[PDB]
Amino acid sequence: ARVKRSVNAKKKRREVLDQASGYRGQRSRLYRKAKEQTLHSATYSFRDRRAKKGDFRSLWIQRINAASRAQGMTYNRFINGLKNAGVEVDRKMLAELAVSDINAFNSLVEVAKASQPQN
Amino acid sequence: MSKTERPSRRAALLGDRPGSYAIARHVRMSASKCRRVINLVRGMDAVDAVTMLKFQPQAAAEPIRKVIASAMANAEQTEGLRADDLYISQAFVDEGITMRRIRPRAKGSASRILKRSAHITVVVEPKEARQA
Amino acid sequence: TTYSPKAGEVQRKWYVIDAEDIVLGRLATTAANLLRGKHKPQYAPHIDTGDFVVVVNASKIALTGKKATDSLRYDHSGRPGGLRVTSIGEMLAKNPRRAVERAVWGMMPKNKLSRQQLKKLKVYGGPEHPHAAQNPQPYEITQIAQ
Amino acid sequence: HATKTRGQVSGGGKKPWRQKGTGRARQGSTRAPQWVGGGTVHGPQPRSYAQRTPKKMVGAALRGALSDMARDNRIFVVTSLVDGDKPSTKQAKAVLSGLAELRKVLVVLDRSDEIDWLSVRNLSEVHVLAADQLNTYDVVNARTIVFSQAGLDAFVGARSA
Amino acid sequence: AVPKRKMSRSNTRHRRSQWKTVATKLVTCANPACGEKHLPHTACPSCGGYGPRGDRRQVVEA
RNA sequence: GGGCUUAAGUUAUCCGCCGAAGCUGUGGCAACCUGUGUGGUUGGGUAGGGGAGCGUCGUGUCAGUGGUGAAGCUGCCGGGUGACUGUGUGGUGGAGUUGAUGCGAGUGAGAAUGCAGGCAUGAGUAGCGUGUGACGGGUGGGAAUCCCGUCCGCCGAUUAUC
RNA sequence: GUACCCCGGGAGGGGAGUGAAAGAGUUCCUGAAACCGGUCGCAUGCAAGCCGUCAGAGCCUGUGUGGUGAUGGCGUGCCUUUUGAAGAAUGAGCCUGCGAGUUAGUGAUGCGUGGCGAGGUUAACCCGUGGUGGGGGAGUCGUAGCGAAAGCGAGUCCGAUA
Numbered sequence: 001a002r003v004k005r006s007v008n009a010k011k012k013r014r015e016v017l018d019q020a021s022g023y024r025g026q027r028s029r030l031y032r033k034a035k036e037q038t039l040h041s042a043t044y045s046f047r048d049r050r051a052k053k054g055d056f057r058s059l060w061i062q063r064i065n066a067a068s069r070a071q072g073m074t075y076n077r078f079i080n081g082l083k084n085a086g087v088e089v090d091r092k093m094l095a096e097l098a099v100s101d102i103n104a105f106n107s108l109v110e111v112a113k114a115s116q117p118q119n
Numbered sequence: 120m121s122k123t124e125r126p127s128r129r130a131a132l133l134g135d136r137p138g139s140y141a142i143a144r145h146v147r148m149s150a151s152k153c154r155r156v157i158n159l160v161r162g163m164d165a166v167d168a169v170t171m172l173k174f175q176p177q178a179a180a181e182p183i184r185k186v187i188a189s190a191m192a193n194a195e196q197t198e199g200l201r202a203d204d205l206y207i208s209q210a211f212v213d214e215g216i217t218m219r220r221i222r223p224r225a226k227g228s229a230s231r232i233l234k235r236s237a238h239i240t241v242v243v244e245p246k247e248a249r250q251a
Numbered sequence: 252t253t254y255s256p257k258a259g260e261v262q263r264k265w266y267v268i269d270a271e272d273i274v275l276g277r278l279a280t281t282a283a284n285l286l287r288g289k290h291k292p293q294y295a296p297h298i299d300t301g302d303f304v305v306v307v308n309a310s311k312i313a314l315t316g317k318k319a320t321d322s323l324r325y326d327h328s329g330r331p332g333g334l335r336v337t338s339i340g341e342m343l344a345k346n347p348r349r350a351v352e353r354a355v356w357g358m359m360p361k362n363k364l365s366r367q368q369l370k371k372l373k374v375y376g377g378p379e380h381p382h383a384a385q386n387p388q389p390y391e392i393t394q395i396a397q
Numbered sequence: 398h399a400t401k402t403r404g405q406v407s408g409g410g411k412k413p414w415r416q417k418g419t420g421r422a423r424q425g426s427t428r429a430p431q432w433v434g435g436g437t438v439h440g441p442q443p444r445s446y447a448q449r450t451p452k453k454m455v456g457a458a459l460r461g462a463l464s465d466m467a468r469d470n471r472i473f474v475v476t477s478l479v480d481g482d483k484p485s486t487k488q489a490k491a492v493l494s495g496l497a498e499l500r501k502v503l504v505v506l507d508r509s510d511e512i513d514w515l516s517v518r519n520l521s522e523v524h525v526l527a528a529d530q531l532n533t534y535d536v537v538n539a540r541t542i543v544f545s546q547a548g549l550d551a552f553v554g555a556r557s558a
Numbered sequence: 559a560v561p562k563r564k565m566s567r568s569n570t571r572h573r574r575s576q577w578k579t580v581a582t583k584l585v586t587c588a589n590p591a592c593g594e595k596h597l598p599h600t601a602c603p604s605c606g607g608y609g610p611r612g613d614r615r616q617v618v619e620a
Numbered sequence: 621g622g623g624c625u626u627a628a629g630u631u632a633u634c635c636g637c638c639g640a641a642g643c644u645g646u647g648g649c650a651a652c653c654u655g656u657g658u659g660g661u662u663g664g665g666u667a668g669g670g671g672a673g674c675g676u677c678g679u680g681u682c683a684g685u686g687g688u689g690a691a692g693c694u695g696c697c698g699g700g701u702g703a704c705u706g707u708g709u710g711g712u713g714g715a716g717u718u719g720a721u722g723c724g725a726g727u728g729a730g731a732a733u734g735c736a737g738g739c740a741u742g743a744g745u746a747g748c749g750u751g752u753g754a755c756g757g758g759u760g761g762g763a764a765u766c767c768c769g770u771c772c773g774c775c776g777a778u779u780a781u782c
Numbered sequence: 783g784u785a786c787c788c789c790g791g792g793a794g795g796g797g798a799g800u801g802a803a804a805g806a807g808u809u810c811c812u813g814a815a816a817c818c819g820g821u822c823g824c825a826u827g828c829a830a831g832c833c834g835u836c837a838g839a840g841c842c843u844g845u846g847u848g849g850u851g852a853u854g855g856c857g858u859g860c861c862u863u864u865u866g867a868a869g870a871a872u873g874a875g876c877c878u879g880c881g882a883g884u885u886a887g888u889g890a891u892g893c894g895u896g897g898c899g900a901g902g903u904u905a906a907c908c909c910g911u912g913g914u915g916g917g918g919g920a921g922u923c924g925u926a927g928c929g930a931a932a933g934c935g936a937g938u939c940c941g942a943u944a
């Protein structure tokens with residue numbers, strides 16, 4: 001029972017060439033070269049799906065820092081004040097408030113100022 | 120599943136628009152050397168193109184000129200158009216059959232030689248289609 | 252979805268800083284922050300949201316210690332023996348704009364966007380600047396307590 | 398089924414070129430398996446697939462296959478099919494009167510039961526057997542079995558407690 | 559020396575696109591009876607003449 | 621690194637914060653243990669051991685299906701934890717082949733300076749094998765490179781003749 | 783097996799005919815990939831790029847999802863072989879096809895599973911010209927071990943009936 005490889009073989013090649021359908025040069029034309037980049041692409045995507053948490057937290061923290069420093073309060077004192085006041089609104093909602101509802105963010109800044117240890 | 124509106128060169132290149140075309144298959148010259156003149160002749164008026172190609176120094180001018188003349192004649196016969204209001208709407212060169220030959224070299228070696236060939240296609244439409 | 256600025260959505264302003272007796276390091280950090288717009292809640296690394304900074308009196312920038320004659324600045328033309336060196340005091344006396352731009356660029360990220368943003372820094376060694384039309388507002392370098 | 402190994406492919410006796418100096422890979426024969434036109438490495442060779450199944454297993458299987466459709470009431474017994482001379486029309490009837498058309502017939506009489514054998518030979522939905530050749534495959538494939546009287550008698554006589 | 563690596567498509571095309579020719583310009587024959595296109599400063603292949611509408615000296619017997 | 625002593629240096633001390641795929645929260649999957657209502661523990665991994673599968677070809681049987689268009693090829697829209705896939709929807713194509721359950725394998729390729737073919741790269745690049753040709757006319761769709769003629773040059777112990 | 787007509791010296795094409803189909807036109811079924819081009823959309827001439835990935839404006843499209851991608855972050859190929867390779871260690875220009883754990887023994891030894899069970903099983907061969915079924919117990923393994931062996935035997939051997 002001789003078996004010809006082509007019908008079964010082309011499936012993974014079509015899959016990989018589809019996955020590599022925006023790459024430059026040989027990486028989008030040649031299966032072997034596309035295969036190497038798809039390994040790197042998968043590794044990068046896995047790494048970046050976990051680094052995305054930190055990237056977005058850093059962005060939120062920077063925006064909160066800017067918005068609170070506009071009110072004469074540093075980010076660390078602002079966060080400690082919120083923690084002491086017991087308001088568990090997170091970095092994300094706080095950044096969205098800073099960009100969108102600056103008055104609500106400033107009210108939270110006042111809450112943190114009042115909840116400061118003052119020591 | 121095969122049926123009607125079967126594909127055709129006229130349908131692909133013109134698609135119910137007025138005009139005609141001509142193909143020179145198996146031109147015994149290189150596709151790149153033909154493209155060197157096709158790039159110049161593309162987009163011109165047909166009479167200006169043929170008159171210029173009578174003077175173009177490259178050897179590719181002659182086959183391309185004959186193709187343009189044939190396309191002009193086809194248009195004049197099958198659509199009533201006149202030669203003086205046609206312009207070369209499209210023009211391209213594809214690759215045809217290549218022959219492998221051998222050139223003997225020093226120390227008993229043999230070097231490959233590729234005798235290439237080209238297909239030339241020219242599509243001519245009335246000049247009114249230029250701004251359409 | 253986190254907010255992201257859209258091209259010209261963030262309006263860029265013009266500040267002017269009098270470098271009179273202000274330490275070069277503080278001036279450069281403040282300028283970099285303003286140029287990149289880190290004081291704005293609309294900040295985004297990939298979109299220029301910063302402001303234009305006009306620095307005046309750059310020839311009177313304060314330096315501590317013996318920096319004015321021992322803190323050196325180097326350039327290389329890319330060919331053997333193509334190094335030139337000049338002290339920061341001489342550079343502030345001669346071409347203060349170059350000194351301030353070097354400090355700010357060193358403190359600013361190494362980006363195409365950072366190169367674009369550094370053009371927004373207009374440094375003049377004297378007390379007068381030609382950008383009255385842009386109407387720069389005075390900016391005071393301050394600190395936030397605790 | 399058979400293939401030619403690198404030793405059986407024609408030619409390929411000499412080393413194609415020198416081991417070193419040519420810039421080509423080291424080759425030992427033009428009929429090496431990685432060559433086009435070379436020998437097959439582990440291709441098929443002629444063999445027998447017969448298995449030495451124990452007698453008790455083979456017989457018991459036959460008994461179980463027969464017993465399943467004995468309990469399902471798919472065994473009929475006829476004195477014979479066809480009378481005098483032999484047609485296929487007659488037995489087609491006898492069997493259609495029995496039931497359906499995925500059939501097995503037993504006539505055992507290995508030498509001179511030509512009437513029944515040649516009658517049912519050409520149905521193409523009937524399998525005809527001698528009682529001494531029942532075999533499990535055919536019993537399982539059959540949807541019903543019809544024994545001739547002699548067929549059933551001879552099978553029982555050949556194997557009985 | 560020998561090419562160390564296969565040149566990329568972008569670089570190969572960057573270099574290859576500069577292998578081209580300019581179109582021959584052609585000028586209308588000054589002879590009113592000819593009106594054909596010929597090379598500048600060259601006798602008209604059709605009328606075989608040269609010069610302005612006046613002069614018009616024969617150059618090629620064609 | 622910029623820059624920093626007007627510490628952004630050293631040191632003691634206090635108050636905050638940042639910070640990992642660690643921990644916690646939430647949702648899904650899996651292995652194992654346990655009395656079997658719960659729950660607990662665990663799931664980086666090369667050589668390598670164990671377990672369970674996908675896809676290709678042939679084939680027994682049953683159910684089928686196919687010019688109202690099989691295989692193959694090629695789009696789109698989807699699906700699964702993976703190999704992969706749709707009983708979605710087109711195009712091309714023209715004669716086969718699907719599902720269930722067994723059986724048998726020439727059953728899976730990216731590497732062997734692997735083999736065969738096709739085709740790129742270098743590149744319109746190097747070369748076109750010692751040299752003297754010029755012109756008039758002819759032929760022709762097309763002529764430096766064919767024919768004829770006239771000038772001129774070359775060989776001549778050979779570029780001759782046998 | 784393309785009459786006839788047109789451009790062409792031809793080659794080739796354009797009409798038309800034949801045919802169910804001619805993009806089945808003889809280089810002729812199907813016609814993949816590398817490779818070479820035309821057209822359209824977006825990006826791209828201040829930029830340092832293992833070519834991706836995450837974030838993300840704008841444009842195009844909206845067949846309201848897709849194409850493209852300014853700009854920011856992070857990020858040193860594949861295989862082999864190595865204490866250790868992105869390695870300036872090896873192999874690979876590219877695609878397509880091919881190319882390596884097979885088979886045979888009433889072999890050796892496990893396991894899963896099925897049959898029979900103090901029993902199990904046949905080999906050659908014979909019959910079935912009708913096969914995959916029946917016969918065939920010659921043998922062979924289990925049924926007692928211990929000893930060089932005679933031998934003795936739930937014992938035996940060394941030993942002195944220790």
Ligand SMILES: [Mg+2]
Pocket residue numbers: 062
């Ligand atoms: Mg910060």
Ligand SMILES: [Mg+2]
Pocket residue numbers: none
């Ligand atoms: Mg289909």
Ligand SMILES: [Mg+2]
Pocket residue numbers: 227
């Ligand atoms: Mg020789």
Ligand SMILES: [Mg+2]
Pocket residue numbers: 403404408409410
């Ligand atoms: Mg041999």
Ligand SMILES: [Mg+2]
Pocket residue numbers: 425
């Ligand atoms: Mg040998």
Ligand SMILES: [Mg+2]
Pocket residue numbers: 401406434435
């Ligand atoms: Mg062979």
Ligand SMILES: [Mg+2]
Pocket residue numbers: 569
């Ligand atoms: Mg370059």
Ligand SMILES: [Mg+2]
Pocket residue numbers: 053
């Ligand atoms: Mg985390």
Ligand SMILES: [Mg+2]
Pocket residue numbers: none
């Ligand atoms: Mg964890």
Ligand SMILES: [Mg+2]
Pocket residue numbers: none
């Ligand atoms: Mg958790």
Ligand SMILES: [Mg+2]
Pocket residue numbers: 663
């Ligand atoms: Mg694991």
Ligand SMILES: [Mg+2]
Pocket residue numbers: 664
């Ligand atoms: Mg773990």
Ligand SMILES: [Mg+2]
Pocket residue numbers: 668
């Ligand atoms: Mg392993």
Ligand SMILES: [Mg+2]
Pocket residue numbers: none
């Ligand atoms: Mg039917």
Ligand SMILES: [Mg+2]
Pocket residue numbers: none
């Ligand atoms: Mg098939």
Ligand SMILES: [Mg+2]
Pocket residue numbers: none
């Ligand atoms: Mg099956």
